[PDB]
Amino acid sequence: ASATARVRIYPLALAKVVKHAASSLQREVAGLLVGKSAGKVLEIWDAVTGEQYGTPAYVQLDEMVMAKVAEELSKSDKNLYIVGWYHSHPGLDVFLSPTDIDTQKRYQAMFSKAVALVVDPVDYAKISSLKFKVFQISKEGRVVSLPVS
Amino acid sequence: IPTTENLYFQGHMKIKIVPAVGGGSPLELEVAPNATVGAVRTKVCAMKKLPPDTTRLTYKGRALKDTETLESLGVADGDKFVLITRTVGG
Ligand SMILES: [Zn+2]
Numbered sequence: 001a002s003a004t005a006r007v008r009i010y011p012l013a014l015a016k017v018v019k020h021a022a023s024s025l026q027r028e029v030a031g032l033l034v035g036k037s038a039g040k041v042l043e044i045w046d047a048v049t050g051e052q053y054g055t056p057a058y059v060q061l062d063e064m065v066m067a068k069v070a071e072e073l074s075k076s077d078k079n080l081y082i083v084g085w086y087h088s089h090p091g092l093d094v095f096l097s098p099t100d101i102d103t104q105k106r107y108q109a110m111f112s113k114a115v116a117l118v119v120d121p122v123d124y125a126k127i128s129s130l131k132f133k134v135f136q137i138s139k140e141g142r143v144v145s146l147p148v149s
Numbered sequence: 150i151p152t153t154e155n156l157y158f159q160g161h162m163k164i165k166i167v168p169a170v171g172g173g174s175p176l177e178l179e180v181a182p183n184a185t186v187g188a189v190r191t192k193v194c195a196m197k198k199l200p201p202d203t204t205r206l207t208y209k210g211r212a213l214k215d216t217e218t219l220e221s222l223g224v225a226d227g228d229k230f231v232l233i234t235r236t237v238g239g
Contacts, residue, residue, distance in 0.1 A: 030236055030238055032236070036172060057239070058237075058238060058239050059238045060235070060238075063205065063207070063235065063236070064210065064211075064212065065236075066231075066233045066236060067169060067207040067210075067212075067231045067233050069169075070167055070169035071167060071229070071231055074167045082170045082171070083170070083171070085236050097238070097239055099237060099238065100238050102237075103234075103235060103236060106234040106235065107234065109198075109199050109234075110168055110170040110171055110197065110204075110232075111170045111172075112171075113171075114170060114171065
C-alpha cells in the first residue's frame with residue numbers, strides 16, 4: 001500500500017508539536033520531524049521549527065530552517081535526519097489539502113518513507129487523545145493515515 | 150587513452166550535496182568553477198531520480214539561484230551544499 005508501515009513517535013516529540021500548535025490558535029504553524037526509518041517503521045525522535053509565516057489557512061516554514069537542520073544532522077554522529085514535516089489545522093480538522101499533498105509528494109520523492117503530521121489543537125479524539133494524524137501518499141497516489149504509536 | 154577520458158577529468162573541484170530529507174548518501178560531484186548551480190542541481194536530481202522543478206540548492210546559509218556560477222560563490226574543493234524542498238501547508 002504505502003512505503004511506511006507504521007510510525008513510532010517519541011512522546012516528548014509529539015508533545016512539542018502539540019504545544020507549538022496550541023500556542024498559536026490564530027494561525028497554522030509548521031516544523032520538521034526528525035528521526036530515522038527502521039525497516040518499514042518510521043521513528044520520529046524529535047520535532048524542530050523556526051522562522052515562518054502563517055494565517056488561519058496557510059503556513060510556510062522558511063527554507064533555511066530545513067537547510068540548517070539537515071546540515072547539523074549530517075555533521076553530527078547521530079544517525080538521525082529529517083523524516084517529515086508537521087503543521088496545524090486549528091479548527092479545521094485533520095487532512096491533507098491539495099497544497100499539503102503537493103508538499104508531501106516532494107518530501108516523498110526525496111525520501112520514500114517521509115510523512116506529514118497534521119494536528120488540530122482545538123479538538124480531542126474520541127478515552128481522550130490529541131487530534132492528529134500522520135499521513136503518507138500511497139503508491140497509487142492516495143492520502144493514507146498511518147498507524148501511530 | 151580514450152578520447153572521453155579527458156572529459157572525465159575536467160576540473161578538479163569536488164563538492165558534496167546533502168539531501169535535506171531522508172538519510173541518503175551525500176553526493177560527491179566533480180565540477181568546474183564555471184559550472185552553474187543549475188547544472189549541479191540537474192545532475193543531483195538525475196542521480197536521486199527527482200523531477201527538476203521541486204528543489205533548490207543552498208550554500209553557507211543562502212538559497213542559490215540556478216543561474217549563479219560556482220565561481221561567483223567562491224566554491225572550493227570539498228565544499229558542501231544542501232538540497233532542500235519547500236515546506237508549505239495550504
Ligand atoms: Zn494543511
